[PDB]
Write a protein that binds this ligand. Structure first.
Ligand code: ANP
Ligand code: MN
Length: 410
């Protein structure tokens, strides 16, 4: 049966998960016609759309922090979530109530008529509706997957960004950097800045930009940055020097400053520095504890692992103990392989559900590793073992981090 405005959010989620979307027509037409019936295409006068393999969420949160510190009204749509669906929509930096979501979903359901929608299209229309009612200055949309045919690409953005390009998957057709970049570049718009924060950009992105007439601004061509004792960013003759080091990856803060620069939004020095000092996201190199250092990071492909490994380097005797759980879909071998550079002891756990790999399915790739019943036990063991100079890193998937967030109820 169909949920109502007054139904709990869990009943909506249960309903959207059970949609029979296998046969529905591929492409933006369905979701776009629904958005048009409900007038949801312009949720705020200023819209930024952020695509990429890794770094979308922390880029959007840097933009968010800076824009809030400037006194603007801001909404962020993000995905996926760790513990609660309500993570996906922030207004003024904060989550909304379950009831606001149930009411917004009810409007979407009324307005779609007999037009079918997937889970993510439904969720994206609902976020647009929540932002529209909220009288916002800026809306930042994180792309769900790819871009081109992502539900968020029904909105025309004022600036679009690609944070990075890397492989997040295994046995896959046409699955190369060029193909990947091409999909992501479909969020670009004719006459609008297209920010690419990927330093090794595939040509297909320039091809798509040139075809649309977007203005491409690439890292290491139009703008750049480096770490110093803050860090520095440049776009042509504009320089922002001695910046505070944020609790997000530097590359993504840089892409975020590029987005803001080309947006030509007027923003103060103080907003930028305050936003940067406030920016962070749970599960993204999140230090949960010291002596021993406990870090949660949702890294789940080789590109993130490598970043992670470089990060663990610059927080260094002392051993590195990894609590890992991953999904079967992912490049488990590349990821583990990359992490093995700096990981000393392995604690492998299983993830629930169909997609979720077995502890042995993980250990299969590791010279030696201990195996466990659940993520929480693996994690609690690693913490027992930790000397005060050690590092315990929880990683491999959103779900692995979520268990410890939720076992820690943080
Ligand atoms: N520019 C980057 N380069 C390499 N790794 C990155 C980069 N940005 C983020 N990461 C890594 O990817 C993880 C996810 O960062 P995030 O900013 O949440 O990415 P995202 O694209 O939203 N994908 P997801 O985390 O699944 O929502 C981080 O914990 C890091 O492990
Ligand atoms: Mn994300």
């Amino acid at each position: 049966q169909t949920p109502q405005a007054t139904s709990p959010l869990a009943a909506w989620l249960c309903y959207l998960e059970h949609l029979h979307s296998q046969p529905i027509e591929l492409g933006l037409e369905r979701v776009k016609q629904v958005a048009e019936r409900l007038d949801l295409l312009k949720p705020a006068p200023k819209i930024f759309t952020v695509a990429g393999t890794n770094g979308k969420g922390t880029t959007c949160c840097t933009l968010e922090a800076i824009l809030l510190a400037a006194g603007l009204r801001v909404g962020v749509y993000s995905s996926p979530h760790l513990l609660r669906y309500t993570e996906r929509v922030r207004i003024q930096g904060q989550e909304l109530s379950e009831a606001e979501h149930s009411h917004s979903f009810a409007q979407i359901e009324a307005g779609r008529g007999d037009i079918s929608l997937t889970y993510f299209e439904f969720g994206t229309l609902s976020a647009l509706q929540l932002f529209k009612q909220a009288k916002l200055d800026v809306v930042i949309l994180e792309v769900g997957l790819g871009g081109r045919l992502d539900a968020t690409n029904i909105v025309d953005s004022d600036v679009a960004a690609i944070t990075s390009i890397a492989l997040d998957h295994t046995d896959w057709l046409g699955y190369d950097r060029e193909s990947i970049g091409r999909e992501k570049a479909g969020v670009f718009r004719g006459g609008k800045p297209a920010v690419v924060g990927e330093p090794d950009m595939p040509q297909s992105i320039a091809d798509v930009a040139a075809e649309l007439g977007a203005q491409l601004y690439r890292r290491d061509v139009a703008w750049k940055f480096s770490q110093q004792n803050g860090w520095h960013w440049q776009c042509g003759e504009r320089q922002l020097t001695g910046l505070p080091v944020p609790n997000v990856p530097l590359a993504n803060a840089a892409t975020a400053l590029a987005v803001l620069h080309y947006s030509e939004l007027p923003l103060s020095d103080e907003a930028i520095r305050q936003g940067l000092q406030a920016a962070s996201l749970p599960g993204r190199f999140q230090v949960v504890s010291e002596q021993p250092l406990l870090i949660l990071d949702v890294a789940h492909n080789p590109h993130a692992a490598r970043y992670l490994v470089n990060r663990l380097a610059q927080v260094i005797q002392g051993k590195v103990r990894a609590v890992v759980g991953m999904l079967s879909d992912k490049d488990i071998a590349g990821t583990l392989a990359c992490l093995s550079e700096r990981v000393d002891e392995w604690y492998c756990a299983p993830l629930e559900g169909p997609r979720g790999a077995s502890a042995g399915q993980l250990a299969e790739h590791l010279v030696s590793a201990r195996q466990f019943s659940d993520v929480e036990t693996a994690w609690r063991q690693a913490m027992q073992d930790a000397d005060t100079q050690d590092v315990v890193i929880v990683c491999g998937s959103f779900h692995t981090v979520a268990h410890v967030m939720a076992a820690l109820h943080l």
